[PDB]
């Protein structure tokens, strides 16, 4: 039994853009979730529908780890029942979410002195995402009555915006890395267990 590759998710060199959030399937391993919940370096650690101190007792078919970067002020949107540009247009948790939301300030990794333009989020969308939906499209968004038909213009917008993270930003405008753990139980051998 390998120990689960949590370092792979949490210590990855670069994170996904929130609009193109990464998902990793975890399987066939032992998870000491204590490595996460006993860490003092996470600024957000919130579990819905389950206590993280009970996870070491349990077995799952698979564990999913979604990861991305957003700004500090937006971490609040990564929870059931939220609204705003992130929850509505980028990463949506369902109302009946069971899992953990873990975040930490990543200014030292992700901000860059001239601005990191490489982290993006969707600013405009026709409708809200469904829970766990991912939209990587890049069609021009019609904000007014006249159609754009593929052409950028006034009230005809490119749908994404760049964060521009700089180390001198206020903390709410600094980058945070986020991992969301969800749990899948199926009719199969449980491939992910704690020490039980």
């Amino acid at each position, epitope marked *: 039994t390998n120990l689960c590759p949590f370092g792979e998710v949490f210590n990855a060199t670069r994170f996904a853009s929130v609009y193109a959030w990464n998902r990793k399937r975890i399987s066939n391993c032992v998870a000491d979730y204590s490595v996460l*919940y006993n860490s003092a370096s996470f600024s957000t650690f919130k*579990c819905y529908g389950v206590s993280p101190t009970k996870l070491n007792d349990l077995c799952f078919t698979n564990v999913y780890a979604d990861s991305f970067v957003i700004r500090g002020d937006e971490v609040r949107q990564i929870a059931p029942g939220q609204t705003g540009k992130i929850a509505d247009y980028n990463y949506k948790l369902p*109302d009946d979410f069971t899992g953990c939301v873990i975040a930490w300030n990543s200014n030292n990794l992700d901000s860059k002195v001239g601005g990191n333009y490489n982290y993006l989020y969707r600013l405009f969308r026709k409708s809200n995402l469904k829970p766990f939906e991912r939209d990587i499209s890049t069609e021009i968004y019609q904000a007014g009555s006249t159609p754009c038909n593929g052409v950028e213009g006034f009230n005809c917008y490119f749908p994404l915006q760049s964060y521009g993270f700089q180390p001198t930003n206020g903390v709410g405008y600094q980058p945070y890395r986020v991992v969301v753990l969800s749990f899948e139980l199926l009719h199969a051998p449980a491939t992910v267990c704690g020490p039980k």
Partner: antibody
Amino acid sequence: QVQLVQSGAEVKKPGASVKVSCKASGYIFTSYSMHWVRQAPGQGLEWMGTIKPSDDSTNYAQKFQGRVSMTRDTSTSTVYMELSSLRYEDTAVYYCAREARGYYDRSGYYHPGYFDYWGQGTLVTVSS
Amino acid sequence: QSVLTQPASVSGSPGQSITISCTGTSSDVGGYNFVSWYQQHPGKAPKLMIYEVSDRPSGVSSRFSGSKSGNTASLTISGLQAEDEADYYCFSYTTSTTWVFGGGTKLTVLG
């Protein structure tokens, strides 16, 4: 978008009862607890109690125990507050409020939510 | 589990900082960190400003902050603006497993 739509204003004689509805839409009704908060005209907010629609559990302020009944109909995503043996001092705007989901912290301790959405209020006047 | 005590009124001038206190007991404000603050404008439902003593929900300006010491929680509004004129209510969990509001504070923006 989350909407909580309450029943219309009511007038009741002392000793009567009132049943106020709160119809939820735009979210999974059974995932969030609902609370009832009331406010007499020109006075403060007063918490009355809560119902958890997923298990039908309720918890009421001692003051209303034995006289309030909160119920839920999952088939219509509606919460109800029935307040019996009304008196003048029950004259108030009654609001339903959704409690945002609570969570467990790192150490396994439970943290409640907070009121994230509100109904429009229902004025109930108790008068002879 | 008895209405928490708040000053009836506070007033400040635009740009100033004001603080609203909320004094309960060891059974509520002093017993837990589950203190919220709600803002209420005339004719409107209350609106969450602060939860868990000091956290803001999304959309609430950082001009709003909260703290607590012993049996007393405090809401502070910095950079006071005309639109902050409203009633403010503290709200706490209690050892009875119930929730209780403070009596409320009317905030006047002077000048």
